[PDB]
Amino acid sequence: NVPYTPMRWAQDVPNTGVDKNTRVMQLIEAYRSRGHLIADTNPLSWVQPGMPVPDHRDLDIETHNLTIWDLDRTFNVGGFGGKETMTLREVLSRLRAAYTLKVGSEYTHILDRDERTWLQDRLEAGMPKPTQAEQKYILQKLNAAEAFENFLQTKYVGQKRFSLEGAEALIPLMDSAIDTAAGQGLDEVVIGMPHRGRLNVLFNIVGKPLASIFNEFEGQMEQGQIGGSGDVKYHLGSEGQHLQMFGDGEIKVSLTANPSHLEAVNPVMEGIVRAKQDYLDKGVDGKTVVPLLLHGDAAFAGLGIVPETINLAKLRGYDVGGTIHIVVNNQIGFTTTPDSSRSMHYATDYAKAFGCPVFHVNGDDPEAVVWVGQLATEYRRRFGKDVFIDLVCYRLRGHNEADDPSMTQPKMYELITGRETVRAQYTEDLLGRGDLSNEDAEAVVRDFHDQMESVFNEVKEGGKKQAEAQTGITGSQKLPHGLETNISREELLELGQAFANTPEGFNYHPRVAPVAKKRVSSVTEGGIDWAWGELLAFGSLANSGRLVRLAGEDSRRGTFTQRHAVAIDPATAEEFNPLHELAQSKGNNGKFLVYNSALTEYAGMGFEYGYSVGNEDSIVAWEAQFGDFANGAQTIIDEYVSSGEAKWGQTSKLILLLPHGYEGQGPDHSSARIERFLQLCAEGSMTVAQPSTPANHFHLLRRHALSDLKRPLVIFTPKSMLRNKAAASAPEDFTEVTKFQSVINDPNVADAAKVKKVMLVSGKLYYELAKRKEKDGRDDIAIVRIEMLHPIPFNRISEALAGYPNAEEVLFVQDEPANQGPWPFYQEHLPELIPNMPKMRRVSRRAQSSTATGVAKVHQLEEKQLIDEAFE
Amino acid sequence: NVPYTPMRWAQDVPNTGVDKNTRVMQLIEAYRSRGHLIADTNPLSWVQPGMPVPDHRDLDIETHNLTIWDLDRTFNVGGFGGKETMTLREVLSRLRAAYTLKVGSEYTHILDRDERTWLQDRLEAGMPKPTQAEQKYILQKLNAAEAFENFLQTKYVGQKRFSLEGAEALIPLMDSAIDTAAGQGLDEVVIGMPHRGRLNVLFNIVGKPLASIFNEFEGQMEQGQIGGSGDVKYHLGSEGQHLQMFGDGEIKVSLTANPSHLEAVNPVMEGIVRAKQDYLDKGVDGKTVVPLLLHGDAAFAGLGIVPETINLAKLRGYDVGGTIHIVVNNQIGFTTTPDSSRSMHYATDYAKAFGCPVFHVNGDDPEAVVWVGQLATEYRRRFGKDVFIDLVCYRLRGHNEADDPSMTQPKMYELITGRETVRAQYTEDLLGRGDLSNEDAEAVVRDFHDQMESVFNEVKEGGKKQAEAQTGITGSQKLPHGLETNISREELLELGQAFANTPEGFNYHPRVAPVAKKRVSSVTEGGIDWAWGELLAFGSLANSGRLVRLAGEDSRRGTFTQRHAVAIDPATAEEFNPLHELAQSKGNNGKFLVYNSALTEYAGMGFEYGYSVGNEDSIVAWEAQFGDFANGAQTIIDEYVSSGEAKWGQTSKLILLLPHGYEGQGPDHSSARIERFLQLCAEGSMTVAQPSTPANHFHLLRRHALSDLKRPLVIFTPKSMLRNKAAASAPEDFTEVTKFQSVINDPNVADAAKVKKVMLVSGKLYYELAKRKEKDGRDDIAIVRIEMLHPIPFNRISEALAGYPNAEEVLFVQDEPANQGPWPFYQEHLPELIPNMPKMRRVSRRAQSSTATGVAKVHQLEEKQLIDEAFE
Numbered sequence A, B: 001n002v003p004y005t006p007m008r009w010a011q012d013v014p015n016t017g018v019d020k021n022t023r024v025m026q027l028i029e030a031y032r033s034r035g036h037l038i039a040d041t042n043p044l045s046w047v048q049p050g051m052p053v054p055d056h057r058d059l060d061i062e063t064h065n066l067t068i069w070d071l072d073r074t075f076n077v078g079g080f081g082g083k084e085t086m087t088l089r090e091v092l093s094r095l096r097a098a099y100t101l102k103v104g105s106e107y108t109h110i111l112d113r114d115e116r117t118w119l120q121d122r123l124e125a126g127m128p129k130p131t132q133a134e135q136k137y138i139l140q141k142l143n144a145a146e147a148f149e150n151f152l153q154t155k156y157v158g159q160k161r162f163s164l165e166g167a168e169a170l171i172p173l174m175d176s177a178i179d180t181a182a183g184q185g186l187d188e189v190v191i192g193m194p195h196r197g198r199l200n201v202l203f204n205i206v207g208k209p210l211a212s213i214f215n216e217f218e219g220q221m222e223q224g225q226i227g228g229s230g231d232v233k234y235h236l237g238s239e240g241q242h243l244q245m246f247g248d249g250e251i252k253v254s255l256t257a258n259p260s261h262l263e264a265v266n267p268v269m270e271g272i273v274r275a276k277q278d279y280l281d282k283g284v285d286g287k288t289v290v291p292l293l294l295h296g297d298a299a300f301a302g303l304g305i306v307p308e309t310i311n312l313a314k315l316r317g318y319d320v321g322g323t324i325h326i327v328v329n330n331q332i333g334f335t336t337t338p339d340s341s342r343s344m345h346y347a348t349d350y351a352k353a354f355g356c357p358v359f360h361v362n363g364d365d366p367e368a369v370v371w372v373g374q375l376a377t378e379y380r381r382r383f384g385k386d387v388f389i390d391l392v393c394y395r396l397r398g399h400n401e402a403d404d405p406s407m408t409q410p411k412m413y414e415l416i417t418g419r420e421t422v423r424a425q426y427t428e429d430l431l432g433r434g435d436l437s438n439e440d441a442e443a444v445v446r447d448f449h450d451q452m453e454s455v456f457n458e459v460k461e462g463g464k465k466q467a468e469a470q471t472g473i474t475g476s477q478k479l480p481h482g483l484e485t486n487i488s489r490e491e492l493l494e495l496g497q498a499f500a501n502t503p504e505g506f507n508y509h510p511r512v513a514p515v516a517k518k519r520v521s522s523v524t525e526g527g528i529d530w531a532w533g534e535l536l537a538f539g540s541l542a543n544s545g546r547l548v549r550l551a552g553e554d555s556r557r558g559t560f561t562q563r564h565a566v567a568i569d570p571a572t573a574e575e576f577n578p579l580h581e582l583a584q585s586k587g588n589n590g591k592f593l594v595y596n597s598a599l600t601e602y603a604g605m606g607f608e609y610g611y612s613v614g615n616e617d618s619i620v621a622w623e624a625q626f627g628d629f630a631n632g633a634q635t636i637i638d639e640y641v642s643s644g645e646a647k648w649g650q651t652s653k654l655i656l657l658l659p660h661g662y663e664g665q666g667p668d669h670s671s672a673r674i675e676r677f678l679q680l681c682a683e684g685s686m687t688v689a690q691p692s693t694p695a696n697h698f699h700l701l702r703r704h705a706l707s708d709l710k711r712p713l714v715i716f717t718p719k720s721m722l723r724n725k726a727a728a729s730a731p732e733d734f735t736e737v738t739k740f741q742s743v744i745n746d747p748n749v750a751d752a753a754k755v756k757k758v759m760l761v762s763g764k765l766y767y768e769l770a771k772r773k774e775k776d777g778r779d780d781i782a783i784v785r786i787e788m789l790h791p792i793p794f795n796r797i798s799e800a801l802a803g804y805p806n807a808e809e810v811l812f813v814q815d816e817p818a819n820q821g822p823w824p825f826y827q828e829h830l831p832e833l834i835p836n837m838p839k840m841r842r843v844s845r846r847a848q849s850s851t852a853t854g855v856a857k858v859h860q861l862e863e864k865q866l867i868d869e870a871f872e
């Protein structure tokens, strides 16, 4: 059992052609670059049958024209090993000790010279010898891990727990990293992980009490929100403190909630870290909250969310100072082996796309694992980049504790069954080298087992409660009754002037300058458009002292060239942000931050959800280029935004801005899928709206921000109505009207006793129906708008309908096909809530498999047909 | 304007320490590895503010301790340039000519020695000088590209076309690759691409007639399916032939349809290629259909689907022999620059994760572009791997032709406006070197313009038609009336025996052997379970002579350990596939292929959809581990599966198998979201079913496969009912019952005149209601099952209800919450279709924000409450 190729027999060769010093330098370079291919990093003596084996002929002395006859000759090595001269025997010895034992390293692909040199120097010095106290501490942590698993196995046999047996070195690795961070003087560590070994990390790293975990197994579950539904035990989070064992440091440790969908926590935990860093406010030399992210081997190589999130690492609105990644490589999926899971040689090969170092370590050598953890945390602090650790280990049982792995992997489980554990091997090694006594080794085991037995008995004394029905979360938060959302006239004029107070030698672009002038004059003469209404809302909130963040694709300029929140000078390329300047000059330390995202919907929306959870007092909004591209983030909508409160008691106030409207641009530029969002709504989970005037958009945003109702808000924004002059607003609507309106009654009814038809509408189709009513002189019709879709404002609709006492019909008019839009939701729910209402009649487009037509002339024909049908 | 650092002044250094020959060899290695960092590959003299500049100090002679005084000394170079000895002046000259001009190359990261040597040899030989005929051919293609763009600009000013101006060298690059493939003797080339330059590729590469394109611009659109809705002009496909210009070769060229969602065509086009290769059947040395895939720079770096699809390249059921990738790098997104789009230095850095070569080429040197195209196609044929080309160019106008790019990128568009085009530069170069006459150069332009003018006039003679309403696609395909789907008794016994005809020294695993015995005995004694019913269906179809493909996560064994389609011997690890053996021994050349996928839902389902389009006569099925993970493939469901026929006239017969059932395993292991699928259904777009007996599943699959209705099928499969003994089937149900049943009436009604309540149910809740009815002895109830959900079998439901003439109530019973499951769909539609039916009454769980509870005791309490409410 020796891992190297034997020395071969050959004749001595002449020193002609390429000199032999050149050949020894090429050998040094080959080991530094490719020595990881023959390193002792696998605990099993296992080669997977269907995977390609890379060529490693570069690592034998025959390929470089050297021979056994050169081993005692002396060569120039140019500073290698801190020496100018050396023998080939000593060169080989040093290379093999540094690159071929229990740690394999990849770092030669890095482009910067100072980075490479730092790693090379530390990797060739070697691992320093640890003290006896340190060694005993590693043994205590290994014992805790294994003991906890065995206890649960014995007391709860059938129950599913996802054990860590085979990979117990994870606990001392995570402990090493957190300890190093506490020594550097940082503030917090945030963890995200999957199912494998979660209950073990909660108890041994985060500090969740043991009574809580035993209660969970007996069927008593802690309640997050009053009337909530809950979730399984390996999807929950917690908080705690960590004290340095040999130091005076202290750090805070947190773990975040997640669903079963793998790798969906990656963008969410990045956002939590960014929000916490922004609140501390320590600058460019700060970045004092550390992200620690755990993965599995199959998931890391397979799912596309992983590289999509790593791509945000060095961008302006997303940087968090680097991420420490740990991949638990146990050489198997569920029933699938690596040959069917990836086309890369290693699972951690995405690192080479981003220019980052990788460390592969054997999971049966605990002292090497502790060294790699320390070295990774130091690299992050100095260079501010991502680092990857690959922990090679195995899985002792099946995927869960009810599965038999021998059915599909017979030969692999011949090597696994009946091994000795990592705790047993380490105890034997220390007793051999005289580093520990037997009394000590026996106390370590006895003490921990007594502790667990004590707690267990205490938990069984208390009787078990019986099951009870879950009530719901509708009334668990209060509604803001009697809140006024209008600003003063002085405040409005100041916001207007912000766009005239340019810096010293700044000029606008000729096509942007008219927009600025109109903003300054409109706050006194009238004609405020949609974009200006939105910015007035965010600006007012930033003045009062809040952090406002807006992110999305092309969101600084706007997709439809409507926003202009940051302007650029054509001559010098200088930037200007008016509303941020005004906010910083009022002495409440408010901020208005606008960012252009990368081209992603899954990672984008996930990052903003995380930001809202990490800072409860910020106002965050994510914008989509068109609302039709939000189905690329369906996982986030279904697993976090729509259902997080009912499952975990985690609340958010994220704002989604989704453009919507039927205008003839085709099936992928027409609908944001209102019907889908209204399906997800129940128990008052979130608010859904489609306003028709800039002032009403202003009031909706301000009510959300100033209330104490911590639930999300989904708005359906316009595309063509942005520049419609019948939709503009007057200044009195921002300063004398006090509240948001959910139903707007018809403003052009001469006499209410002559009405015989009522039309209900939502959105931009109002302005067409109104136009036609004026042209044809119809005094028997009244058009009523619905601005808030969920919840249903049934008291207001009832009040409006009651105002027309001679009505015989009610029509519901929409632009969308009959199986889309708000009609399905309203035809089900509204008749129950208003019993005395006449039967409703739909007027819409026919039902379709796609969203809309692809021909423009057909679109125009359909619209004419629709409006004609509405007016008999 | 010289691109190199000037030679510096220094003193001569002594030849001591590290020898100077060693230093010259290190310089050669540095240029081979990192010389692309200073290559002349950008047509503009532009450096983006905000992007990091890599260190390239390795490329100057000072860092290797050499000086101007060494330039005329002679050194040993070890075969470089085919010489044993050389001067430092000649070394530098050769390195600069190979690695620093118009082509930059990355290949030193490849692990195989033979690959590296092949590339190195061809890259240092240089580009061979082309003939005059070849040069004139390149000029014809450049002219065609530019001329077409200018014509459309002049005749249709406002209309959106997404021009290729700035990147016209793409047309000769694609032509070079297709020409090389025709010389190798291959069969087809399949293309997938986005919006940028699509109408140009359709006319100049694929051969779509010009009349068709002009008609599109005048509003006359070609119809795909009778009564279809359509799509915009830059989302359509076509077919054609390509003849070799200087050869006797011929090849077929195809382009595939796609939606606006970027990069969603990547898995679909890979599947099309695999299906075509399988039909030709030329073996391991075949792989004679070439995939050619075009991207944009922002999309390639940002979206996660790209690396997820590249990861399938070398896997057993997905390999297609390599893919040629082209990235059109025009240095801008929409309004976003590379500094805000990626954290990699180049857009093509994912190549380094997979071990593949990259070529960067200047888009204003057309002869170099043609060389790189040829070299890439040769590399693919020899090594069978992926290859990446980065074409560096610019965008002349805005994102579309209605946008002003100076608002946000002022300095970049100072360099672009008023340049001379690539056609103009190339014409000037050839006239200078005496390679072309003026008469020739003028004829090239005049001839092409005359051709276009001719066609245009012809198109305007014919009058324009007026718009007409679109009718729908419901009746465009026929239903299989009078088809019988039963097999013979002889066929059933033969299928059974397949599991007894083991190879010579094969034995089953002890926990798999009972399953095999039961399969052999059940075909004569009874008790056939769910999994065996499914396999009997697929086996029968493979016997008749069809290719059957089943793919999914852990689909060979089954997630619930139920299928065992391939078995493994514990002693030797040999594999056995019974139903494939039987099919190949019947002389119709049938196949049963089962594969375990990687851990992906987006790339998995996309690949299977593509397979169904590439071979219309195959039976393809994709399986999900649980139906709750299908929201990771929402793009494919919404943009391709649900709506492809109505948009493009593209038909498919894919089968989706989605596990579903409420059993107490929590919110991410309970629902496949039936409500979402029933929203997408209209115009008879696809079939949705939830069967309750193995025989009925058998008949459903066989009706789909033997009919001529080319639409998809979505089935909701069980988890616990897999092993329920009340659900098993007898042999007569496969051999004497002729058809599939859509409604199953109650089999335990003594007297039909005493019934006073009818219950409607679907799925596994039947077996609980039936149980209770027997226990309590209720003769006033009848339970009726619905097996096909869409379309609605309203004639059968009417017939069943009419059989009970004294009924007073109808109850609809489901397990799902009230805002989920089939109730929303049925409460809307069923009362209209059956006017005389009593009012329906719901019995279900309450409405919820999440799918299900997380506590198991609460689940049991809810189920009891539900069934009690049903029975008064």
Ligand SMILES: CC(=O)SCCNC(=O)CCNC(=O)[C@H](O)C(C)(C)COP(=O)(O)OP(=O)(O)OC[C@H]1O[C@@H](n2cnc3c(N)ncnc32)[C@H](O)[C@@H]1OP(=O)(O)O
Pocket (backbone or CB within 6 Å): A474, A479, A480, A481, A482, A483, A683, A684, A685, A686, A687, A703, A707, A709, A711, A739, A742, A790, A791, A792, A793, A794, A795, A796, A797
């Ligand atoms: C979904 C959520 O965010 S929590 C909703 C929880 N409640 C329910 O779902 C119970 C059933 N629903 C209902 O009774 C109705 O839909 C209601 C009460 C929410 C609204 O019905 P109406 O009375 O017709 O609506 P109206 O617009 O008059 O609202 C009344 C008050 O509620 C407030 N309000 C209503 N919806 C919201 C909301 N989403 N956010 C904040 N305040 C709200 C209004 O500001 C108003 O305050 P005021 O009394 O100071 O003027």
Ligand SMILES: CC(=O)SCCNC(=O)CCNC(=O)[C@H](O)C(C)(C)COP(=O)(O)OP(=O)(O)OC[C@H]1O[C@@H](n2cnc3c(N)ncnc32)[C@H](O)[C@@H]1OP(=O)(O)O
Pocket (backbone or CB within 6 Å): B474, B479, B480, B481, B482, B483, B683, B684, B685, B686, B687, B703, B707, B709, B711, B739, B742, B790, B791, B792, B793, B794, B795, B796, B797
């Ligand atoms: C969605 C698709 O795949 S195409 C559907 C197109 N048609 C429509 O949508 C029109 C409206 N729909 C209807 O009228 C009804 O829903 C129907 C006609 C589909 C079924 O009505 P019912 O008579 O209640 O159902 P039933 O199951 O008895 O169907 C009768 C016949 O239709 C056939 N059939 C029904 N649905 C399908 C289907 N999805 N695939 C194949 N055959 C089908 C049955 O095989 C049967 O054939 P048979 O006459 O040889 O016995």
Ligand SMILES: Cc1ncc(C[n+]2csc(CCOP(=O)(O)OP(=O)(O)O)c2C)c(N)n1
Pocket (backbone or CB within 6 Å): A196, A260, A261, A262, A295, A296, A297, A298, A299, A300, A330, A332, A333, A334, A399, B553, B599, B625, B629, B632
């Ligand atoms: C997105 C998604 N797809 C599929 C699954 C089903 N699933 C659960 S565990 C698992 C295997 C995970 O393998 P690996 O990442 O190696 O985890 P390990 O069991 O080794 O810790 C799969 C496919 C899932 N939960 N989420």
Ligand SMILES: Cc1ncc(C[n+]2csc(CCOP(=O)(O)OP(=O)(O)O)c2C)c(N)n1
Pocket (backbone or CB within 6 Å): A553, A599, A625, A629, A632, B196, B260, B261, B262, B295, B296, B297, B298, B299, B300, B330, B332, B333, B334, B399
């Ligand atoms: C999935 C998705 N997200 C967003 C968009 C919106 N969109 C259309 S084009 C575009 C920019 C594409 O940039 P690039 O890939 O460089 O293309 P180019 O215009 O340079 O050809 C974006 C974000 C889209 N169509 N699809």
Ligand SMILES: [Mg+2]
Pocket (backbone or CB within 6 Å): A296, A297, A298, A328, A329, A330, A331, A332, A333
């Ligand atoms: Mg694993």
Ligand SMILES: [Mg+2]
Pocket (backbone or CB within 6 Å): B296, B297, B298, B328, B329, B330, B331, B332, B333
């Ligand atoms: Mg681009």
